[PDB]
Amino acid sequence: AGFQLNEFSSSGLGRAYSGEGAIADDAGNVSRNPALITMFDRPTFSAGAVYIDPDVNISGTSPSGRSLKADNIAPTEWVPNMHFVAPINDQFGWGASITRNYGLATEFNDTYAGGSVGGTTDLETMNLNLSGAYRLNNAWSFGLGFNAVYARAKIERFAGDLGQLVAGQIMQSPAGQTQQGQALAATANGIDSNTKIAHLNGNQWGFGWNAGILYELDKNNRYALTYRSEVKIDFKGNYSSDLNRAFNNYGLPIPTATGGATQSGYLTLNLPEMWEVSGYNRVDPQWAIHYSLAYTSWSQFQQLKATSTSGDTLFQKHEGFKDAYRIALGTTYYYDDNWTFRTGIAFDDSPVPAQNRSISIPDQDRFWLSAGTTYAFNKDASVDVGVSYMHGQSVKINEGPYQFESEGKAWLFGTNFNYAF
Numbered sequence: 062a063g064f065q066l067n068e069f070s071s072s073g074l075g076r077a078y079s080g081e082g083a084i085a086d087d088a089g090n091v092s093r094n095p096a097l098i099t100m101f102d103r104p105t106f107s108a109g110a111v112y113i114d115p116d117v118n119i120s121g122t123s124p125s126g127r128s129l130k131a132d133n134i135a136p137t138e139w140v141p142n143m144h145f146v147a148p149i150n151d152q153f154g155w156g157a158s159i160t161r162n163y164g165l166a167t168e169f170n171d172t173y174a175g176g177s178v179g180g181t182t183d184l185e186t187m188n189l190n191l192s193g194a195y196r197l198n199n200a201w202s203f204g205l206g207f208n209a210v211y212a213r214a215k216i217e218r219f220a221g222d223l224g225q226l227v228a229g230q231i232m233q234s235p236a237g238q239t240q241q242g243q244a245l246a247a248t249a250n251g252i253d254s255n256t257k258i259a260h261l262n263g264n265q266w267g268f269g270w271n272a273g274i275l276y277e278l279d280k281n282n283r284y285a286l287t288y289r290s291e292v293k294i295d296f297k298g299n300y301s302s303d304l305n306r307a308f309n310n311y312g313l314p315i316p317t318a319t320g321g322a323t324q325s326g327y328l329t330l331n332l333p334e335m336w337e338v339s340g341y342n343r344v345d346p347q348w349a350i351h352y353s354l355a356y357t358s359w360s361q362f363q364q365l366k367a368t369s370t371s372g373d374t375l376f377q378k379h380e381g382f383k384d385a386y387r388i389a390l391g392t393t394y395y396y397d398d399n400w401t402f403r404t405g406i407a408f409d410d411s412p413v414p415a416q417n418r419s420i421s422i423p424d425q426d427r428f429w430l431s432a433g434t435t436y437a438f439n440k441d442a443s444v445d446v447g448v449s450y451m452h453g454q455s456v457k458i459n460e461g462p463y464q465f466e467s468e469g470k471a472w473l474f475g476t477n478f479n480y481a482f
């Protein structure tokens with residue numbers, strides 16, 4: 062789902078995040094729907110983390126004859142999560158949490174033949190949420206939240222085999238027999254594959270709000286609607302390219318060369334708004350069913366465009382994403398006072414139109430299968446453990462002068478410790 066993340070808690074991870082927003086067995090869920098606060102009778106704490114181990118691979122052959130094979134370009138991630146919920150009174154409550162709604166990590170060896178569109182891509186996001194909720198009656202509750210998002214990002218691209226390709230072309234041309242052409246070819250050949258073609262890094266804060274509506278027929282059946290506003294991060298960081306400035310202003314498809322000099326850069330990153338409808342049904346003292354449909358407006362992510370203090374475009378990449386949906390269904394089986402078991406299935410559509418696919422964001426439609434279990438220590442303290450398997454469809458990628466093919470899957474493991482005072 063682009064670079065969107067749903068791992069806000071270990072439980073739920075075991076649910077395949079189905080019906081989040083309509084379930085409140087532990088404090089984690091307030092982060093997804095502030096209205097659920099009215100479901101807590103006392104200060105409740107939750108904290109843990111999810112290890113995401115992706116297995117994304119790239120295959121292909123370049124016009125240079127070199128392999129575009131790149132195994133495991135998606136590094137494993139560690140997504141912590143922490144929550145606290147507290148009643149103000151039988152009418153209002155509040156909560157605070159630290160989670161990750163967005164993130165991405167793609168890494169190619171700097172000598173990768175397709176380095177110009179490979180290299181390194183890292184996006185780290187942290188969401189600090191503060192919420193409040195109001196219960197109107199036995200059925201309706203309302204929640205509103207404020208969010209402060211800290212983001213650390215870094216982008217690096219390399220020459221790859223472009224120098225070789227350029228040299229080849231010059232040499233196959235009438236210019237190949239000329240002094241100017243030869244000097245040109247020498248230079249092109251001289252551009253090593255690990256030559257840093259572009260560098261972009263920065264950290265910045267963004268702000269957004271969210272809200273939720275909870276409606277419960279009774280104490281065992283509820284539905285929810287939530288909205289997470291878009292969050293715009295206005296980066297002000299550093300840009301550079303180790304290429305010689307003599308490369309500039311010819312119209313070449315290459316980021317602005319700065320002779321290695323660092324230049325101040327601006328880039329706005331749009332973090333997509335999200336909508337979600339949820340349902341939780343406890344059809345028995347030991348069985349509950351949960352499901353949801355989420356809609357993330359990825360069309361809000363149109364491009365990555367870095368700009369200089371003069372307003373010149375130093376680096377630009379069209380993304381052209383489209384809105385996407387996510388569907389999830391799961392059930393929880395409360396065996397006894399100590400044990401609770403859960404499973405889930407989910408499907409999230411990729412927001413990237415085929416012609417806009419890039420190897421930097423190896424996304425694709427995903428199917429999730431998961432299982433988890435929770436051990437209750439004493440009606441006040443518990444531990445959650447969940448696992449999920451992600452399987453994605455292999456797709457073709459045409460980027461620049463290259464044709465790639467990618468496949469990706471993933472294993473997720475998480476644990477969270479819960480405590481209610």
Ligand SMILES: CCCCCCCCCCCC[N+](C)(C)[O-]
Nearest residue numbers: 184214261262263296298328421
């Ligand atoms: C000061 C500029 C800082 C730029 C770092 C921006 C990172 C944006 C992360 C989104 C994913 C990047 N990608 C793959 C689309 O290029």
